[PDB]
Request: fold
Amino acid sequence: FTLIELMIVIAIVGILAAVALPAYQDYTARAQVSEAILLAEGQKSAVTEYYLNHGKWPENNTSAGVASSPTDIKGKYVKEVEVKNGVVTATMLSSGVNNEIKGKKLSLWARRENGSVKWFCGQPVTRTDDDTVADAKDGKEIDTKHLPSTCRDNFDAK
Amino acid sequence: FTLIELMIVIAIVGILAAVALPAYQDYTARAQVSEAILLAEGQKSAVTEYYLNHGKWPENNTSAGVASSPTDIKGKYVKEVEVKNGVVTATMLSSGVNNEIKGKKLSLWARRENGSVKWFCGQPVTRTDDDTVADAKDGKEIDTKHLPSTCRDNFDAK
Amino acid sequence: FTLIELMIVIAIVGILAAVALPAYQDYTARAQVSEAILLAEGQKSAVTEYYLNHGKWPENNTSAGVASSPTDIKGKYVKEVEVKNGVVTATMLSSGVNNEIKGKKLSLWARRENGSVKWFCGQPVTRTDDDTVADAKDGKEIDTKHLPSTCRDNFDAK
Amino acid sequence: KMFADFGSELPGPTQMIVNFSHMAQEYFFHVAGSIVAVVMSFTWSYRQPLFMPVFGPVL
Amino acid sequence: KMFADFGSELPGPTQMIVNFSHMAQEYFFHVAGSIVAVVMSFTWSYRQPLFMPVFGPVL
Reply:
């Protein structure tokens, strides 16, 4: 006979949350990845200096002169950050993150410019030789959709 | 009869993005220019030394002792950086930038202080004589709105 | 009935700017002071040499062998730099600076180590005798909060 | 509400990008014409279950 | 159709970049819920304008 204004408006806010759910869920993940990136960076300094001073990429965190323990460079969504031959990889925690990005990671690596180096940011990579890395293809890479426009670099970016 | 909470809140986030569009679009451009500036600088060193050691401004990159190729001093938003008689100009790429700043550029030039020099940063300029430059008036200058407060220098700044 | 997502998010960015306002305003001032310090230094050379070669502190800029005119040692935020009996004071311009630091200044002074001298950096000081200075107490000193950790020296620092 | 939800830029609307409070206040016209519609059909449902002598209630 | 035309990324839609045929087939849900709505209002408009003797229509 009457009461449909309360029933529809409670059910439009319910469906509004369902539509606002995936937007906040990638905005959210995309936000948790933007930090793995900040934790990865700022460690470029150590790695850059080590390379320019010696001409060899730092083998591990200790070589680069950073928390000798990967797990000591963690965060809220970051379970750690390891330096492996100049390549700095950031791992996403398992608690406090999206759902399709946890335990997932990215990498920052550089290239000899000769007198200086240039840095790249993208999906996990392994270093082959002092001037070549390759996709750490394995299945734990953070999905392209969660990576900034500034971190879409490919293993062979120059 | 009911469902307007879902319809309005999906349409307020839509218009919120439209209002947040121009803010992120100049904040963004203003960010891509701040780098053209960083790429232009750090090349002041070469140019300064060349001038103080010889009393003549470096004619080109090679003279200044930098990547003999302008295109070798590029970046993400920077298509290059050329040294033309001590004046260092930075060009904005065509891909990955705002829209009203691509292919656009700025300049850094210096002036003899006698025993040292002082640097300026602003819209493109050409060098006339060893102590005078002028607006490279041509239409490809990065718009004042995109330039930092520290890079508003005029051709005749002293 | 609906549109509050656009209204709140435009009003959270508004209040975000108000919270980011004082942070950028002391980071900013603290940045404009860090230069008054760089302009003050590099003039230590002249002053040091003058003292070691003669055993008397340079009375003024000309004595120290620097731009005979204080105003000739100015900058963007620096209105000048004067050498007064070995003490080098830097004045903050009136245009282009914070708001509570303009027309304000700091000093660099040294002390005979016997065979060499040691430099100090802090709030304005006056020289009394060849080995003693004192607070140029007058009200135009740059506030402690704007001074680096490396420039917190007191008139009687040894 | 159905004809007024058939898109944007109808007769009397606003564009969706206004601030919500202003959009809702301008439509106040239509929110009002709906309430009046309600009051009327309520009145018909509540009620419903010069020649001076011509004006008197007769038998 | 007009709530489902308020922008993109509603409940149950697709993104516009799919191929048209797939977009239209996924919405088939909603095309169906509309036709059923039609059939119903048509039914209401069409309809709406052993003791053997017990079964005969009387007066």
About this structure: The longest helix of chain C spans residues 5-40. Chain C touches chain B through twelve residues (CB under 8 Å). The domain at 2-158 of chain C is CATH 3.30.700.10 (Glycoprotein, Type 4 Pilin). The two ends of chain C are 71 Å apart (CA to CA).
